[PDB]
Amino acid sequence: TTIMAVQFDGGVVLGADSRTTTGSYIANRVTDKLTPIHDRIFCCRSGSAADTQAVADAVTYQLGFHSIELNEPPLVHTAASLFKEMCYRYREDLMAGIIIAGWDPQEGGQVYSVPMGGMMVRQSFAIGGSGSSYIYGYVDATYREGMTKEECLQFTANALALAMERDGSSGGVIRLAAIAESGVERQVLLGDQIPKFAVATL
Amino acid sequence: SRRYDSRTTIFSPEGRLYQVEYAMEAIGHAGTCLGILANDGVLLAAERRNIHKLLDEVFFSEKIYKLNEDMACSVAGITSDANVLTNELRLIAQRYLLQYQEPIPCEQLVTALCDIKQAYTQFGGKRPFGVSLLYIGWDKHYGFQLYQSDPSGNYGGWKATCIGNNSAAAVSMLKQDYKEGEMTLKSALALAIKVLNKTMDVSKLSAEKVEIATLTRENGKTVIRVLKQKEVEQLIKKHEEEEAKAEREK
Amino acid sequence: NQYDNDVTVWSPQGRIHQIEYAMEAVKQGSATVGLKSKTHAVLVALKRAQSELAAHQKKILHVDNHIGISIAGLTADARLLCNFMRQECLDSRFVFDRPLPVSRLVSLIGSKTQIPTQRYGRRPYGVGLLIAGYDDMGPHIFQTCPSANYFDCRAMSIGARSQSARTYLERHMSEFMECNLNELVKHGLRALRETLPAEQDLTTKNVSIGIVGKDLEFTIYDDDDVSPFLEGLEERP
Amino acid sequence: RFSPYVFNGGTILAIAGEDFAIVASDTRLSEGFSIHTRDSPKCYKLTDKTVIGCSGFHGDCLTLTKIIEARLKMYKHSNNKAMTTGAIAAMLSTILYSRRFFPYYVYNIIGGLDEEGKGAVYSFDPVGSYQRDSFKAGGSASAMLQPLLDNQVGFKNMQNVEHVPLSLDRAMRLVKDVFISAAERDVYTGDALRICIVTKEGIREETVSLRKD
Amino acid sequence: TTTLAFKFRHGVIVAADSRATAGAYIASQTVKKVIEINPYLLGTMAGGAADCSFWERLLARQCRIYELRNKERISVAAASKLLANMVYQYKGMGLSMGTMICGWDKRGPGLYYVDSEGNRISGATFSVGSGSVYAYGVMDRGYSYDLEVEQAYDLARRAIYQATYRDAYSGGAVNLYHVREDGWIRVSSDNVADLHEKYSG
Amino acid sequence: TQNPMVTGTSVLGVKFEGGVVIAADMLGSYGSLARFRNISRIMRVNNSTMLGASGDYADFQYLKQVLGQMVIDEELLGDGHSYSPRAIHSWLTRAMYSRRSKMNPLWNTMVIGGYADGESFLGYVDMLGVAYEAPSLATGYGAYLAQPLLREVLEKQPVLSQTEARDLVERCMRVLYYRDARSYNRFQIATVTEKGVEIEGPLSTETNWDIAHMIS
Amino acid sequence: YDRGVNTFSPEGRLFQVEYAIEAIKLGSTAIGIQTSEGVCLAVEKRITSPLMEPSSIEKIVEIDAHIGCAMSGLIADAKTLIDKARVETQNHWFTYNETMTVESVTQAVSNLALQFGEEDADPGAMSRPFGVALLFGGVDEKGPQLFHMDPSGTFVQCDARAIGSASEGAQSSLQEVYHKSMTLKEAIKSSLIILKQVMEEKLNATNIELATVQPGQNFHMFTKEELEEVIKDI
Amino acid sequence: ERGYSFSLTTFSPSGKLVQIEYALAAVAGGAPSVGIKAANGVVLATEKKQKSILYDERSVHKVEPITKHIGLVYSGMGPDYRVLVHRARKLAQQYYLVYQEPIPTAQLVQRVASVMQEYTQSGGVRPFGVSLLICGWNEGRPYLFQSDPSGAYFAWKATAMGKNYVNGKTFLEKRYNEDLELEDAIHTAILTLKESFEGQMTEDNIEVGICNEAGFRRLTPTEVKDYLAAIA
Amino acid sequence: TGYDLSASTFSPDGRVFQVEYAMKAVENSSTAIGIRCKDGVVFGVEKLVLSKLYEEGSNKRLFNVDRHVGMAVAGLLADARSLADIAREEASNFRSNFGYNIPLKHLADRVAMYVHAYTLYSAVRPFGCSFMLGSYSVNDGAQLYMIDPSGVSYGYWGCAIGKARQAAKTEIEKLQMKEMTCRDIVKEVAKIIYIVHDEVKDKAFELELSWVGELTNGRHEIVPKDIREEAEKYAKESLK
């Protein structure tokens, strides 16, 4: 699968591909790769499916308990740090890459990346997955700072469509989710709605 | 915790051990158990106290259990201690059977139980198992053989012994009316009926008040048979007939 | 009563009788007066013996090349805590390759001695330590009471009959700092002298010192090598 | 795969005189094909009568040196006296065998003076076998140094040659010459030398330039 | 590496070469390959020099404890069994040690062998090392239970000389030990070159 | 750590009068892929000690977190003392050696610069736990590219001014950018002096490609 | 019961340790004298009946070839500490290729002393303090040495000390007859005469155990013939 | 957490576990309960007297099942009953896991008795203050077991724990038949419950479980009040 | 007896007399006051001078448990040091597990839970110390939580612990501390602590004063010396 997240002024837009393959056969052709840790925090998971599921569930547990203890909603940096600790403590057998994005009142829309290894750093745009390699040029040539919600959504959709139609490990449909003060709203792009690009037929 | 400890695993100023003394006294007012040896078998007579008509009484025996293939036991005192002790004895007997591919000798199993009971009295801070055990069985080395153990961890080998109320009277009756080396199963059974009638004279001999068990060696096989209610009635009738005959001859 | 037979009990007056017994034992220990200057810190202890035949057991322990202690109370507990502190000092020299500062050593031993005040069936270490050390922040003198509470002090006197030494230290504390090494050790020796009554004498054969300086590693001096320090000493006041 | 060991180079030599001990070592720290620094003496003075030469994997060298320092301090506090050369040798052998299943990839030479005012040089191995010899060289160029030490100091395989016990000047000149020779053919040594002279007067440190290559 | 030992009427003789090699390189030519466990007990080192030395020293400590506790000199058989158990508990752990221990006890002279493999064997004659296969020839062809002290000495010296000459991992000098009722005596320590010149002429 | 998954390239550092200067690129490479290009591979221990790191980046993050926490503990002690750069170097050495001894090492090579008590310190530690101090230090490929030039110029001038050290480090970063695949045109440089620690944000190097027309 | 094992007194000391000292004075009488030519240890056997073998009644034990020890009190409890001291001395020898110093042996014995409790350490530990006073006589690099090990852990280096049933008074008399320049023969003669004077019963070779450590010779225990030879002059 | 290693239960000079007698006294002071056997099943009945109607008597349950074929009721302390029934459920599940067959009621009661004995002979713990009436069906047979706080157990055709328990036992003995049906068992149980309810029983105040060849199942208030109406 | 021997038992009424004795042991100690204002939280603790041979700043009752959290204590000072060590350990754990400094509310809640945890078993005894923690945050402001030896943590506009705690509270009520300025509140703390100090009861005395707040860049610190003499002079003048 391929996962892509970009922050806009006041919130974040996240997207994921819906392909999981146990080799050349697709284990799940509509798989969900963006999981809500909190009402304003999402994690884009990639790599080992079992590792991603276990890490996401354990983080949901611990962060929910921690937020209940604080009586306040958590922060994106806090969640990303807890993912970082979880991945670093188990980098030997937990093999996964998680993009942690969302909004908090104190910092706003923020995105972090914790690839395999257990390291945390914030990025304006974050890319992960097996198909992540094919879209660095497109995101570098298309993304400019100061984007809005709708154009971040469109740019993420275009980049993920390119990744999924150029990567054999990514395909199916694309799940987009915008998180901000208004809340979380999620849609799926399927078939015709996915941005298809010109093909060099000769 | 110094003030509030019960310190049941320490000595006494006069050298005795109050916990084992109290256990023996409680066993003394507990149910009646009797074990006897015959030239062709060994017999057990156990007395059940709680005899309410509400009992389902479906069990084959209440205070008499089967430790292993060739050895039976009779318990005296706390029946829950009795259950945990009995299944521990079965576990270790089967452990010996696994380890040596040979039925566990009765002396071996009694020694192991006395070891664990003595250690449990020695330390652990817990009240000792206030249950007396009377083991019968057959082995390659001594055949028919029966032991009486104590909560203090001491055991002894006997030809016949009884525990419960009127223990001194019962052992006196055995010493008076037991024919060493010449005790057949029938005469042993009659002596057991006599003891059951006398050592508990209150609530005179009743069929449902006691349970009777036998252990014999047929064709190289140890057979443990629990005498049925009709059998116990036959014992009662035989005892009444023999007592009447003795009194008439008197 | 029942407020003095255990450590985890609370007296109605708000005190721990075991801690009181430990702080009585530290006073019942032998006399030890420690003090410091602007550059050097010296401990002076009088070594008690069970009889005239005994050789006046050492009370000053070498815990590190820059830090030293003197004990007053339970010798076995004192030795255990001395081993624990020297293990910390060697651990610091092994890890950070630096002498472990006196203040942190005293804080660590205080934290160590706090746990017995809470643990069930656990007794306080009935010995008080006078710690003389030198580090980057100059000489430091600490008194760790068996009460698990440490006091930073310019000059402390511990043991029986210590009130006279305490008065001497309070009187001359204004001038302890600026005097040189021989004057400092003489002041400490005179405080220990005033600790004892007039008829007894500050004989060289039963007094020992432990001194650490700016360039001087913590060294202990005994009967023969405290004789130059016991020169020109005034008679008992 | 991770390799817990690497050979950092370095050469240690020692000669035990009748009244003195000399322990010398280059200050070249190496790694594969790159030289790190021109100053890292392999000689470490424990007391005024004992110095240690440790060569090989530098991490094990440093950790073992600090372990020896810590054990020296603990023994000093326990016994209220410094350690003898033989005691240090036995302690270091025990420490080496304490890591039998994770061997210290270090060569150790114990150069010092005993109570009789006599030089004593103790050779070791990565595991902890030790002995006392009049002179021993270890490390990268042990093979390039032992025969010359045997022929000169021990006067081995010589005819019509009386055996003069070596003096301090002879030992110093010989060790300087042997490292001059070693720095040429061996690539792991050169560019400097630190020499520790252990005598009743104390420990004297002398630095000498070698083939700077 | 070459050690040999054999018992006879007047005690036991142990001989050993004094060459220790680190691969194809002679590390030292003065190794005391014979370890003095006690003034009455002897060991050797063959294979891992450090492992042999450490285990012999630990056996010395254990037997000193046993002697202090039981007011008796430790039996050679008891020491052999203790060392065999101590080494065997770490079998298959990379240990490469092998040594024969001899002495005089309540049962007269006694020689036992132990190794890193836990093989504890008694016997009259033994030899372990690189050249021990060679020392077997000379020792077995010249051994007699009724040899005099000098005959035992020069038989052991000749066997070590032959082993050192034919083998390449054995050399330096021979160390000779005679174990009798009271204890051990260092018979001699002779250079192999002097031995060769004496045997040739 | 079994294998380094994202790796930052070499770190360079020299010492001048009354201070030291360290530099490292801001790129975290996932093998042959440069995923991160603005991260900081230099961590500030305190106002007197600073660290530059190569190798794996997650282990560097963990090490930075631990070092910052223990410096916070030292500050909370409030004893009027401060960990010397020598102490920091020793503690990193000991942690690295313990980490390898458990056969789970840290794929990082660290250069520890510092300035305390009028002494400029420049320590070197690696994954395998080797520790030493030198006037010039360089990790990774910098040990083969810059460290030779560093050592040559330092042998020529035993002591060089702060601006000379900065120019030398800039030239060395230029050379690494030319002849290292894991480098980046923008790098982060920092100085530790008596005033404290200063990280001069993102900085770039000048590139000359006049030889590209010489091919024929 | 009620009172714990870690309970002090109102004046600030362990009454359990006071009871241990009382048991020390309940122990057998022992005497140790250190001189410049060695150290001597002696003890009264307190033979209960002639049927008891004098061989098994020995209060003097060898810690090493250069160290002897005299025990008074719970002789059964002293042998465990003696075994620990011997194994520690042999560990020190195994580690440093030298004989362990007597002072370090005494310090380690003190380390083992006063290490007990109910719930303070591993359950397989001591519950009560050692109730044995010890006299460590020995010869090492510091010449002949003698150490009084108190069960309190307050180890002492003393030239001469008498412990046991007749500890006090006899110790003062020994001090009065003791000098700082006495030979080994004078030391053994003085110790023997003081022990004979303080004997509660008529003593002979079967009532006392004597041992010595010399600067040259190892730790040697006086057999019956030499015991009679040295006691006939007294 | 340290944990006392000395058993709070100790043998009195007469050997009587007076602590266990006090536990049985607490059982008697607790809410009463009855159990009865039929020729083809077992019926357990008990009363749940809460406070004024502010308590939602429907929300809480007193009769509890262990398996599909085993149920039980208690007389005594609810806090002890909850942990005891939870442990019995674990034991039954473990036995089913090991042997892939339903727990026999006798073996389950033996395990509960072993647990009670461990509690009574261990340190730092209070004996359970409940008496369990356990109904079970296996091998086409009914089983009803009395288990006491002392740790012992019995197979009782009828039983009554709690207040007036001896009179309840006598009343059961008088109104017990050897070959009665389940309907007769329910009639007898409800008759005993109303004879010893003390306060005008209600379908909510009576909760009953039945165990037969079809399994164990708790009667809902509809058929509960139906049977109370049929019994009067 | 029986109802006051351990913290694991109730009184026949259901009281904890061991905790009451801990309250007594914290009341009889020296005074310690903490005032939070809109732009800072200050602590002024009273130091008993056993002898003039002691150093100023010895046996501090002010601990710095986090980068931005202080701790003013009263009661057993060794117990206070142990509790400060536990608090800084908890802060370190939170920083490691969440990547940012712990908030004061959760810090105080966790420390109070820890304190209460050692008031349940006979194997331990309740802490003989009460302590006030003050911190500052950009999004939270100045915060101050007082914690009892029982294990109860509450937010306090201004609290006092010790002998004259109630007098210090009552006279400082005239101050509207919830919207005051930290600098002048330091001087007012010096005032209140001087009046509530009993010179006759304790002839020798010393003051340890500190604040944390926005003026500190959100990091706990001690008062600078010059402000210390100025506040001391103001307190001397207010003594009248």
Q: Which two tokens stand for residue H87?
A: 């442990």
What ranges make up the beta strands (E) of chain G? Answer: 30-35, 38-44, 60-64, 67-73, 132-140, 143-149, 156-157, 160-163, 208-213, 219-221
CB G175 within 8 A of CB C50: no
CA distance D96 to D105: 10
- C-alpha to C-alpha distances, I141 to C130, I136, I188, nearest whole angstrom: 44, 5, 21
User: Which residues 6+ apart lie within 8 Å of I17 measured at CB?
Assistant: C10, I3, I4, I11
| A174 CB neighbour count, 10 Å cutoff | 26
> Is residue D202 packed enough to be buried (19+ CB in 10 Å), middle (13-18) or exposed (0-12)?
exposed
- Length of chain G equals 234
Report the CATH number of the F1-216 domain.
Answer: 3.60.20.10
Single out the residue of B234, B194, B188 nearest to residue B215, CA to CA. B188
In the CATH hierarchy, which fold is given to the domain comprising A1-202? Glutamine Phosphoribosylpyrophosphate, subunit 1, domain 1 (3.60.20)
Breaks, C-N > 2.5 A, in chain D lie after none
Amino acid at residue number F125: V
Tell me which DSSP letter residue G217 carries.
Answer: S
The fold adopted by the segment(s) E1-201 is Glutamine Phosphoribosylpyrophosphate, subunit 1, domain 1 (3.60.20)
List of chain C residues whose C-beta atoms are within 8 Å of the C-beta of residue I78: 110, 113-114, 117, 147-149
How many CB atoms sit inside 10 A of residue H103's CB? 23
Ranges of each domain in chain D: 1-213
Burial A134-163 (b: 16+ CB within 10 A, else e): bbeeebeeebeeebebeebbbbbbbbbbbb
Chain F residues inside the 8 Å CB shell of I92: 69, 72-73
Minimum-distance CB partner of F79 among C94, C96, C101: C101
Q: Are G104 and G112 in contact (CB under 8 A)?
A: no
Q: How far apart are CA G209 and CA G212, in angstroms?
A: 11
Q: What technique was this entry resolved by?
A: cryo-EM
Resolution in A: 3.6
Token pair 């003669």: residue? G189
**Pairing, β G132-140 against β G143-149:** antiparallel
The interaxial angle of helices H105-121 and B79-100, nearest 10 deg, is 100
Name residues whose C-beta falls within 8 Å of residue F61's C-beta, 6 or more positions apart in sequence. A84, A88, A118, A119, A120
Nearest to H155 by CA among H167, H146, H142, H164: H146
Q: Are D152 and D146 in contact (CB under 8 A)?
A: no
Q: Do chains E and A touch (3 or more CB pairs under 8 A)?
A: no
d(CA H193, CA H189): 6
Q: Is E49 annotated as a binding residue?
A: yes
Residue I176 DSSP SS3: coil
Helical spans, DSSP H, in chain E: 49-70, 76-88, 132-142, 149-166, 192-200
Retrieve residue I222's tokens.
């001690």
List residues bridging with F120 in a β-sheet.
F115
**Residue with the two structure tokens 């190097």:** F205
Contacts 24+ apart (CB under 8 A), C218-224: C218/C62, C218/C63, C218/C64, C218/C65, C218/C66, C218/C67, C218/C68, C218/C132, C218/C133, C218/C134, C220/C58, C220/C60, C220/C62, C220/C68, C222/C58
Q: For residue B80, what are the CA distances in angstroms to B121, F97, H81, H118?
A: 18, 59, 19, 10
Q: Which residues of B171-207 are buried (b: 16+ CB within 10 A; e: fewer)?
A: bebbeeebeeeebebebbbbbbbbbbbebbeeeebeb
Rounded to 10 deg, the angle between the F142-156 and F162-179 helix axes is 150
- Contact B194/B173 with Cβ under 8 angstroms? yes
Strands C219-221 and H130-138: unpaired
Q: How far is Cα F55 from Cα F65, in angstroms, rounded to an integer?
A: 17
The label of the residue with tokens 């020293």 reads E57
Question: Who among F105, F128, F131 is closest to D6 (CB)?
Answer: F128
**Spatial contact of G42 and G102, defined as CB atoms under 8 Å apart:** no
Q: Of the candidates H159, H158, H160, H64, which has an alpha carbon nearest to the alpha carbon of residue H112?
A: H64
Query: Is it the case that chain A and chain H have 3 or more CB pairs lying under 8 Å apart?
Result: no
Please indicate if any CB of chain H lies within 8 Å of the CB of I124.
no
DSSP D20: -
Tokens of B109: 């199993």
Domain annotation for chain B: domains and CATH numbers: 1-248 (3.60.20.10)
The SS3 call for residue B46 is strand
Give yes or no for a contact between A57 and A96, defined as CB atoms under 8 angstroms apart. no
Structure tokens at G225: 């013939």
Dist. CA B139–CA F99, nearest whole Å: 62
Q: What is the DSSP string of chain C?
A: --SSS-SS---TTS--HHHHHHHHHHHHS--EEEEE-SS-EEEEEE---SSSSB-----EEE-SSSEEEEEEE-HHHHHHHHHHHHHHHHHHHHHTSSPPPHHHHHHHHHHHHHHHHHSTT-----EEEEEEEEETTEEEEEEE-TTS-EEEBSEEEESTT-HHHHHHHHHHHHHHTTS-HHHHHHHHHHHHHHHS-SSS---GGGEEEEEE-SS---EEE-TTTTTTTSSSPPPP-
Which range marks the domain in which residue I118 is found?
Answer: 1-238
Breaks in chain G (C–N > 2.5 Å) following residue: none
Using CB atoms within 10 A of its CB, is residue H27 exposed (0-12), middle (13-18) or buried (19+)? buried
* Phi, psi for residue E113 in degrees, rounded to 5: -120, 140
- The residues that bridge with A23 in the sheet, in sequence order, are none
**How far out from the chain centre does Cα G207 lie?**
17
Q: What is the C-alpha separation between I219 and F61, in angstroms, rounded? A: 23
C-alpha–C-alpha distance, residues B197 and B200, integer Å = 6
Residue B122's identity, in one-letter code, is Q
Q: Does E65 touch chain G (CB under 8 A)?
A: yes
Instruction: Characterize I160-185 residue by residue with b for buried, 16 or more Cβ atoms within 10 angstroms of its Cβ, and e for exposed.
Output: bbbbbbeebbeebeebebeebebbeb
The backbone torsions φ and ψ at residue A29, rounded to the nearest 5 degrees and listed phi first, read: -90, 0
The burial class, CB within 10 Å (0-12 / 13-18 / 19+), for E48 is buried
What are the backbone angles phi and psi of residue B207, rounded to the nearest 5°? -70, -50
CA atoms in the 13 A half-sphere facing the CB of E146 = 0
Q: How many Å from the N-terminal Cα to the C-terminal Cα in chain F?
A: 48
Give me the phi and psi of E139, to 5 degrees please.
-60, -50
Strand partners, H212: H215
Q: Residue H143's domain is classified under what CATH number?
A: 3.60.20.10
Chain C residue with minimum CA distance to F98: C95
**Cβ within 8 Å of residue H107, ≥6 positions away:** H95
Calpha distance B91→B249 (Å, rounded): 52
In 3D space, the residue among D91, D88, D125 whose CA is nearest the CA of residue D105 turns out to be D125
E116 touches E95 (CB < 8 A): yes
Tokens representing residue H224 in the block: 């509960």
Measure Cα distances from I174 to D124, G75, I38, I46 in Å.
Answer: 80, 76, 16, 22
Domain count, chain I: 1
Exposed/middle/buried for residue H55 (C-beta within 10 Å: 0-12, 13-18, 19+): exposed
Give me the helix-helix angle, A76-89 and F57-77, nearest 10°.
110
The edge-to-edge listing of strands for the beta sheet with H215-219 is H158-161, H33-38, H41-47, H206-212, H215-219
Distance CA F71, CA F82 (A): 9
Task: Give me Rg for the CA atoms of chain E.
Answer: 16
Distance CA E144, CA E13 (A): 12
Scanning F53-72 for CB atoms below 8 A from I yields 65, 69, 72
Q: What angle do CA F18, F21, F22 make, to 5 degrees?
A: 155
Phi and psi dihedrals of C160, rounded to 5? Answer: -65, 150
Which amino acid appears at position F166 of this protein? R
Q: Which two tokens stand for residue C82?
A: 């001395």
Q: Do I105 and A77 touch (CB under 8 A)?
A: no
Name the region of G33 (left: φ>0; alpha: ψ -120 to 50; beta: rest): beta
By the 10 Å C-beta count (0-12 exposed, 13-18 middle, 19+ buried), E191 is classed as: middle
Q: Does G48 touch chain D (CB under 8 A)?
A: no
Distance CA I207, CA I195 (A): 13
Closest alpha carbon to A14 in A126, A131, A119 = A126
Sheet holding G67-73, edge to edge: G60-64, G67-73, G132-140, G143-149, G156-157
**Do β-strands B160-163 and B33-38 pair in parallel, antiparallel, or remain unpaired?**
antiparallel
Helical (H) or strand (E) element with G107: helix G102-112
| Paired tokens of F121 | 């310190």
CA angle A40–A42–A44, rounded 5-degree value? 165
Burial C207-235 (b: 16+ CB within 10 A, else e): bbbbbbbeeeebebbbbeebeebbeeeee
C107 touches chain F (CB under 8 A): yes
> What is the distance of C-alpha F36 from the center of its chain?
18
**Helix, strand or coil, per DSSP, at residue A43:** strand
The CATH number of the structural domain formed by D1-213 is 3.60.20.10
Which site among C10, C36, C120, C154 would you substitute to test the I interface, given the most I Cβ atoms closer than 10 Å to its Cβ?
A: C10
The 3-state DSSP class for residue G146 equals strand
Q: What is the Cα gyration radius of chain B?
A: 19
Strands (E), F3-74: 7-8, 11-16, 19-25, 28-30, 33-36, 42-44, 49-53, 55-56
Please say whether the beta carbons of C41 and C151 come within 8 A. no
Written as one letter, the residue type at F124 is Y
Identify whether the C-beta of residue F74 lies closer than 8 Å to the C-beta of residue I92. Answer: no
- The residues of A carrying an active-site annotation are 1
Q: Does D7 touch chain G (CB under 8 A)?
A: no
Q: Is G49 exposed, middle or buried (0-12, 13-18, 19+ CB in 10 A)?
A: exposed
List strand residue ranges (DSSP E) for chain I, in order: 32-37, 40-48, 62-64, 70-75, 129-137, 141-147, 153-155, 158-161, 205-212, 221-222
SS3 B58: coil
* Length of chain C as a residue count: 237
Q: Which candidate, C40, C107, C47, C96, places its Cα nearest to that of C68? A: C40
Q: Any idea what DSSP says for residue I178?
A: G
Helix (H, G, I), strand (E, B), or coil: what is residue A131?
helix
Number of domains in chain H: 1
What letter would DSSP give residue E73?
A: P
Which amino acid, one-letter code, is at E26?
Answer: I
* Distance, CA of D174 to CA of E195 (rounded, Å): 32
Per-residue exposure over F60-87, b if at least 16 CB sit within 10 Å of its own CB, e if not: bbbbbbebbeebbebbbbbeebbbbbbb
Range of the domain at G43: 2-234
Coil, helix or strand for B50? coil
Tokens of D198: 């252990």
The answer to whether A3 and A99 are in contact (CB under 8 A) is yes
Q: What is the DSSP secondary structure assignment for residue H128, as one 8-state letter? A: P
Single-letter residue type at I21:
Y
Per-residue b or e along H83-99, where b marks 16 or more CB atoms closer than 10 Å to that residue's CB:
ebbeebbebbeebeeee
Beta carbons within 10 angstroms of residue C103's beta carbon: 21
Q: Find the helix or strand (DSSP H, E) in which B160 lies.
A: strand B160-163
In this structure, what token pair is assigned to residue F33?
């892929």
Measure Cα distances from B29 to A1, B33, H16 in Å: 79, 12, 10
Residue I69 amino acid letter: V
In order of B82, D152, H56, the CA distances from H12 in angstroms are: 19, 92, 44
B52 interface with C at CB cutoff 8 Å: no
Q: Which of I64, I102, I106 is nearest to I81 (CA)?
A: I64
**Closest C-alpha to H33, from H25, H23, H43:** H43
C-beta atoms of D78 and G95 within 8 A? no
Write out residues 33-52 of G within 8 Å (CB-CB) of E.
none
Distance CA A31, CA A157 (A): 17
Q: How far apart are CA F197 and CA F48, in angstroms?
A: 6
Cβ-contact B190, B238 below 8 angstroms:
yes
Token reading at H23: 């536990």
Distance CA F14, CA F20 (A): 6
How far apart are the C-alpha atoms of B132 and B134, rounded to whole Å? 7
How far are the Cα atoms of D210, H2, H232, I18 from residue C3, in angstroms, in the given order? 77, 22, 65, 11
**To which H or E segment does residue F3 belong?**
none
